[PDB]
Design a protein around this nucleic acid. Structure first.
Length: 60
RNA sequence: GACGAGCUGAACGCGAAUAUCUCUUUCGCCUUUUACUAAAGAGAUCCGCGAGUUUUGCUCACGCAGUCGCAUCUUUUUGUGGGGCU
């Protein structure tokens, strides 16, 4: 299901890269605006912490 | 007629951020089950959050103190007095 975090981070990347390189800034490494995708994965992790504690407690 | 920062307790309650899961169905992947899609609903959970005195921990601070058991010219507190008739 974390294909939706991956699709969301891909959309976030398209938007940020488009709005970032406008002008002479161009087309490569160098964009480090990471808080949008960071918070995508933080939401993933908050929601999956209970599921994974269950699964790992069951494994244990 | 009058005074808080930080923690754990409060017991009541969901500005703007939102992820996961379960169930009942439909739809799509399609050999099967997981693992998934996207619709309808019904339910949970997570990560957090606000105010009341409880004080624990100040490292701040106090009591003749800011407050006590409208003030003379025609319209208001400077009144028009005095007498006497049924």
């Amino acid at each position: 299901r974390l294909m939706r975090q991956i699709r969301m981070c891909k959309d976030l990347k398209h938007l940020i890269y488009y709005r970032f390189n406008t002008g002479p800034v161009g087309k490569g490494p160098g964009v480090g605006f990471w808080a949008p995708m960071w918070r995508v994965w933080l939401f993933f992790l908050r929601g999956i912490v209970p599921l994974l504690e269950r699964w790992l407690g069951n494994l244990l």
